[PDB]
Design a protein around this nucleic acid. Sequence first.
RNA 1: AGCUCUUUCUCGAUUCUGUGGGUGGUGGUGCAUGGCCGUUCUUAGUUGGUGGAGCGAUUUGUCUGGUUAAUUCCGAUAACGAACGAGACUCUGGCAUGCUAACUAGUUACGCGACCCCCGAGCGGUCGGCGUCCCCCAACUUCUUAGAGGGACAAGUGGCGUUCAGCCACCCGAGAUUGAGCAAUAACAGGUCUGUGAUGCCCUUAGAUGUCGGGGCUGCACGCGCGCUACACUGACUGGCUCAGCGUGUGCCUACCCUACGCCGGCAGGCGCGGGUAACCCGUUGAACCCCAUUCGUGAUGGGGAUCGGGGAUUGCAAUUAUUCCCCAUGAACGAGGAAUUCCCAGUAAGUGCGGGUCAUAAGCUUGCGUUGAUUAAGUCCCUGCCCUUUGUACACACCGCCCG
Lengths: 141, 98, 162, 53, 59, 73, 68
Amino acid sequence: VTVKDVNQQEFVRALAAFLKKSGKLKVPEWVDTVKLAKHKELAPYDENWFYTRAASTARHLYLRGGAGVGSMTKIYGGRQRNGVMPSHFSRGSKSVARRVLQALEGLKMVEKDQDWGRKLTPQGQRDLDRIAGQVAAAKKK
Amino acid sequence: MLMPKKNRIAIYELLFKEGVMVAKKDVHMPKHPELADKNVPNLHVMKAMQSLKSRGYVKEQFAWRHFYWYLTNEGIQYLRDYLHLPPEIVPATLRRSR
Amino acid sequence: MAVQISKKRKFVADGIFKAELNEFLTRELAEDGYSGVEVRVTPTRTEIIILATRTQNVLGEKGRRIRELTAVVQKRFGFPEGSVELYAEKVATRGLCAIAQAESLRYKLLGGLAVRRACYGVLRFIMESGAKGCEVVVSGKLRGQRAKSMKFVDGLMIHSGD
Amino acid sequence: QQLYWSHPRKFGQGSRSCRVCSNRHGLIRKYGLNMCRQCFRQYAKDIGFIKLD
Amino acid sequence: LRITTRKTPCGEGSKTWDRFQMRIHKRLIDLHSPSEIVKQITSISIEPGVEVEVTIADA
Amino acid sequence: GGGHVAQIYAIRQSISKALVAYYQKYVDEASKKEIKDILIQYDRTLLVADPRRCESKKFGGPGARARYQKSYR
Amino acid sequence: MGRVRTKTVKKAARVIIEKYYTRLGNDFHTNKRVCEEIAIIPSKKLRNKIAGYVTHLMKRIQRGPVRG
RNA sequence: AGCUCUUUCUCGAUUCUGUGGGUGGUGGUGCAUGGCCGUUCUUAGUUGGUGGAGCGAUUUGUCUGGUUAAUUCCGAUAACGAACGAGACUCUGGCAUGCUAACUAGUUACGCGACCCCCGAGCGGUCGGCGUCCCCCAACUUCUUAGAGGGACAAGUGGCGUUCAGCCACCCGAGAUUGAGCAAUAACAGGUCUGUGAUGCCCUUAGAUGUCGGGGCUGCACGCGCGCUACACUGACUGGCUCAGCGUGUGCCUACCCUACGCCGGCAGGCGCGGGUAACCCGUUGAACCCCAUUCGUGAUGGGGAUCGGGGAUUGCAAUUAUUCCCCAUGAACGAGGAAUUCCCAGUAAGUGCGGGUCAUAAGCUUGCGUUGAUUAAGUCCCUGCCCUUUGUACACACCGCCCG
């Protein structure tokens, strides 16, 4: 495994947990309260979820040259039920993603990229690749 | 239509020198680009011109809300009189060609 | 500097400009047999060639009316003096310029004349020019309460397609 | 002089018309043409808008 | 360029639609030289229906 | 381009056409014919592109053949 | 059926065949070239449609004299 | 509002006052009119020359039959040879490892090192490995592009039919019918004077029927039409896979753009930047359905999101009669729709998002576009509608017509 080698769900699942063990990520004190998207029906069932998003994002950046919060809000953004009106896109929160981006920096997984947008760092690039291997290794099944 | 005895001169005098006038069909811009020692827009200029035309002296074409004003021969004499000016006058024709 | 303007907006703009111009001349040059215009962009001038066949009237005494027109076009199209320029130009045969023939009917009827004489005459003249065919329709109300229309055709014409 | 005589004209239907005919209704504002639809129908040939399909 | 309108001016009637187009076509060509062959090669090549722009270089 | 199913069909076609294009320049003709045989037989279009493509919607319905609604009076 | 050749086409076929029989052939591809030589036809689709119907005729003629 | 008035300055022959006369009107009449437009109609309808047939208007041509999407064709026929609509014609879109090309489009493949990760292997140097970045005196046109090129003619073959016109199956292969645009003869008291400086006459015209302040257009026992959203477990939900396309922009006929990226805020949004007349940038439009690992569990419940209350913000000088958006709360009917009735044959129905028009703000709209993509006739004239003969008719403002006490 390149991270590209591992399936997205298991990769994210494994990394997100690894982050949880590490114990040092950092977390707008909120996260209990927050929905994550105006579109959103209820907050996240796994109140633990902050880690999962972080993993998801780290993987998301590693794939691509550089990305920023607006893109993430939309990615997270689902369809919002206008009620009487037909449903439409609504890019998902900007505080969570930003905080995610800021926090990741602390670990050095990602760093400000040139010309705007955060890019993965070689430190992160190394870190993701390492867990990617661990996941591949676990088993067949 | 209505107006000053100074603005009227500005209109007549420019008209006599130009031989042509244009004004967009608006009564609000109050001022118009080009000339305009400023004071007006269609009105004083439109109205004065409209009056000038009714008595002859000028022929007016509307198209596209501009109103293009063309000075007539009888009119040249008339403005000649208002300006009082030097006979041979010589407004917005003089000319060469080929 | 710029002053610029978008290429798409630019072309549409030019088209509208041509629409004004064509409308203005159509209304002024009527006695002139104004047939149509062509505006050619160049470097350092804008030339407007008026295809009309009564160019003598367009010219004017001592070279006049054309000047009076150029001046107008120049003033209205914020064309600083001298770039823009007007030229008259006789149209080859007045017989195949639908527009010349139409203006003619307007004049004949306005003149006072009859209906069949005017139409038939125009038709005969057009056919004499040696055209393919021609048709003139008069719609509207003459002398009475009720509207009526007439079709006066001679020769051959094709209705449909490219 | 007559401070009296105007209220905002910056925007809305009331801020624009037909360069052809004054009408503040059914106005084509795309590509900066600014012609009312009824007129645009009559001038679309001279502007360069032609029927193809 | 696409314009879509109801065929009436003014409405009661099967709702019918008309769409006019105006088709802009662009091209460029890259020359290196000077003096005459510049203003020459631009200016013939002239007449209908044809916008032309010539640009110095870099920016 | 396309979307999720659209893509699958395209990639599979590209792969089989690929393999055959390759046997045509480097291997021998009988092999490639053998392959076109197996595909073409069981198939799915693998070596030939399905034509079918959007028809344009026409004023008076929001689809191509769908016509709006009428009440008469 | 839906493709019933119209007179403007069918006429040209009778026409050419009358003045072209020993030149024309059994095969679409060649008459099509021949129509360029022996006739002035405005669009390519028409010329094709002509070549094609006249060939259908030549195929028939060369199996039994045809009605007109 | 010096509009009016008080007070008394100011402009300076413009105007005032009188007569005659204009001018505007979103004033009226479309049943006074042009144009434009709907409808009959994209129906198969329409006409001349020349002859035949008749005193004549006229008629045949333009038809028993077959065939066709089409008066499309064949044949027969006192007609022959043509034109008009249909068609051909034009436009759009698929098949072209062919064509000529491309740094304001990409691709290969280097040179590729680097970032560089170790992902696996190796102790490591080193090998294979997905991307980004380097950009180059690399190469290319395959994807992309837009120009020219060719392909479909039901071409071959086989059944059927006057053994014809055609019909059906089959092959190559894009398969005969991809989908629009173009519309005659002649009509209508169809619609439009509120598109028109198109327009008549009329009406009005200083105490205006020509503009500003303010409201209505948005007033609710009730009916109707187009729609939207729904009635749930093919679902509602939370995390997570994840791909697009038609189109669009500022530097503007007079006030102003599309907006990536940092920060603050739960949101809504606020705030700082920087590029872009654009194939350069927003935008490899990283869309949405969908797919999926969970929860729910058949409860109007988590289906549904009405109504209302409070509150946050955006547009505008001004939003109260919510412009709109959000956050919470309040959490309706609706648990499949009678009489009726629309529309539809393949990227079609249907689900599903997006962009453009309106636009300062405002989409439940219209108007396209891609995405996901069936069921189902493959025909016929029963009902309905319209045109084909023959026929009947007291009809002819033509059955929505005109007969007895």
